[PDB]
Design a protein around this ligand. Structure first.
Ligand code: NA
Lengths: 81, 82
């Protein structure tokens, strides 16, 4: 593939896999490559909300937000208690 | 800090999203604790040919997570493909 950078990472994946599983696999060649840039901030929020009707409660929220791209996403939202 | 408006607006987003998805009927009151985790890296997807022993050949899809501003890489998954 002439792509020595990606091959080195492929060999590492094989080595790591063998290390975990004793699969005894031998790297032969890299047939497909894809590089996914991930750049963002994982926000952890503790939030107080007013429930219906009246009671106040605390929730833990987790929000994923990208920096170079217009994208935010609620990962999880569960009661603290 | 939980007093930065930028953070509060995101907390508002969280509450609104939860209401939209689950009909939770919650009203944002305040943001009491904030934590920012920077994430910067590359998720590599590789289809790799290996030799067993076996000793036949087989294809695997590997995922490797790698941070760019830190010296860290990690095997995420290693699955056999048909
Ligand atoms: Na969503």
């Amino acid at each position: 593939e002439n792509d020595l950078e990606a091959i080195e990472l492929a060999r590492f994946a094989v080595a790591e896999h063998n290390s975990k599983t004793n699969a005894m696999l031998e790297f032969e060649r890299l047939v497909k490559v894809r590089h996914q840039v991930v750049a963002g901030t994982m926000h952890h929020f503790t939030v107080q909300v007013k429930e219906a009707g009246g009671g106040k409660k605390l929730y833990e929220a987790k929000v994923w937000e990208k920096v170079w791209e217009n994208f935010k996403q609620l990962q999880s939202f569960q009661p603290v208690g």
